[PDB]
């Protein structure tokens, strides 16, 4: 779909989630956007 | 209950006479419809008139 999907710079209607804390089960949607907290430092909504 | 998303109803209708407590006999339900919702439960609430 190239020839569609593809406009200038990058289409942000088509997203993916990069990170997850756990493996979701198949069939599974979460549009959660929780921020991924790899440590026990609250992440408090911000990257770092 | 919910598998993989589908949500299965089953249901039963019989006439009783309790008094208090439960009654005494044997059933079965039979399948009413199925739901393709596919959202996650935890909890439910009754609703009452």
């Given at each position: 779909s190239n020839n569609l999907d593809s406009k200038v710079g990058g289409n942000y209607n088509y997203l993916y989630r990069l990170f997850r804390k756990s493996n979701l089960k198949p069939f599974e949607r979460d549009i959660s956007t929780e921020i991924y907290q790899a440590?026990?430092?609250?992440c408090n909504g911000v990257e770092g | 209950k919910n598998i993989d998303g589908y949500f299965k109803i089953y249901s039963k209708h019989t006439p009783i006479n309790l008094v208090r407590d439960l009654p005494q006999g044997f059933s079965a339900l039979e399948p009413l419809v199925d739901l393709p919702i596919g959202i996650n439960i935890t909890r439910f609430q009754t609703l009452l008139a």
């Open positions: 440590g026990s430092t609250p | -």
